[PDB]
């Protein structure tokens, strides 16, 4: 029967990471699988869709075996203990006894054989990349994912490998975000959709230090390794929209302005737009942008900004939240609006970088 003795700070970060997918439904899913084998403790958490595995080297006497314990109670116990506490675990009966100083806890278990098991699968695409790149790719597009659309496939993020680039796409039908980044390796053409929860857990495994991210992608799964932590998710079934095809066919009208000035203009105008529909109106003219908003209350706001624009004049309406979202994501100094006409989408970009494009559809 399973036994190990470990410092608390060895367990904090791992217990925290694997408790990710953990409201309560099916008791086993609120448990973590614990496995002592080969001088190693493994901790696994799961929601049936995805699972995260953490390994802790054991430098003290231990004995092999396995069980499951409530994740959150076991974490809160180890988090609640003082700094530098020795945590000694053993089994007797269908319980797990945890002991540190004069603090003693007895947790209920469920059999390890009962713990849900994501089926074996085969990797068909493999690459590494820096964590900061995976972050940028997710941060740049995450916000455009559909919320709980019946097109299950929009409630996820496209991950596309092409040439030497990894690219992410996200859209809810009304607006779209695409980001591509180089990763120093030649890759095959492949596209998969990672589910909402998978993007969260994965963004969350990025500790923001040096360890590179090892990815493996199969037909219906994806896996990321970093440090001694391993995330795996099912992929969403279906076919994601082609971004090449949403991107405005050839915008003739380019506008440049300060990202902050434009954000704050729109954030201010947004206050007096329709609470339901959130419509604001844009009037572009030589070197000037007028943003206006009105509501059923007959209240109105008006913001005039100096910009760089020399195309033809036009009016165009937007859901101001879609605009603000894009501008909040573009943490940069100047923005590029690429217009065509009042009934066509606009492409928005950082003026200095073509890494990420945003397409928003007009009202």
């Amino acid at each position: 029967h399973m036994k190990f003795t470990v410092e608390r700070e060895h367990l904090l970060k791992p217990l925290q990471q694997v408790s990710g997918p953990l409201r309560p439904t099916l008791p086993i899913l609120g448990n973590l699988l614990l496995q002592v084998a080969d001088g190693t403790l493994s901790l696994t958490g799961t929601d049936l869709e995805m699972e995260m595995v953490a390994r802790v080297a054991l430098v003290q006497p231990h004995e092999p075996g396995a069980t499951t314990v409530p994740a959150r109670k076991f974490f809160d116990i180890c988090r609640g203990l003082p700094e530098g506490a020795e945590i000694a675990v053993q089994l007797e009966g269908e319980r797990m006894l945890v002991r540190s100083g004069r603090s003693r806890f007895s947790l209920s278990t469920l059999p390890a054989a009962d713990f849900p098991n994501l089926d074996d699968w085969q990797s068909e695409v493999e690459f590494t990349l820096p964590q900061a790149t995976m972050k940028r790719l997710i941060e740049a597009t995450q916000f455009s994912m559909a919320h709980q659309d019946v097109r299950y496939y929009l409630n996820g993020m496209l991950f596309e490998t092409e040439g030497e680039e990894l690219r992410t796409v996200a859209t809810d039908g009304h607006r779209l975000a695409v980001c591509s980044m180089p990763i120093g390796q030649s890759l095959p053409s492949h596209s998969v959709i990672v589910p909402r929860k998978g993007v969260i857990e994965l963004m969350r495994m990025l500790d923001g230090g040096d360890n590179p991210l090892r990815v493996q992608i199969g037909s219906n799964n994806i896996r990321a390794h970093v440090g001694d932590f391993i995330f795996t998710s099912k992929l969403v079934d279906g076919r994601f929209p082609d971004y090449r095809r949403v991107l405005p066919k050839n915008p003739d009208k380019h506008l440049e302005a300060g990202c902050d000035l434009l954000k704050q203009a729109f954030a201010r105008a947004a206050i007096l737009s329709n609470e339901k529909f959130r419509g604001v109106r844009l009037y572009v003219s030589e070197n000037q942008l007028k943003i206006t908003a009105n509501n059923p209350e007959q209240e109105e706001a008006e913001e005039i900004l100096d910009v760089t624009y020399s195309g033809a004049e036009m009016e165009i309406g937007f859901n101001v939240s879609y605009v603000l979202d894009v501008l909040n994501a573009l943490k940069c100094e100047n923005v590029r609006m690429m217009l065509t006409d009042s009934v066509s989408s606009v492409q928005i970009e950082d003026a200095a970088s073509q890494s990420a494009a945003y397409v928003v559809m007009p009202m």
């Binding site: 009304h174 929209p241 419509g279 859901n319 989408s345 559809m361 009202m363």
Partner: peptide, 6 residues
Amino acid sequence: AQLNLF
């Protein structure tokens, strides 16, 4: 109010 792509 707000159109879908395509």
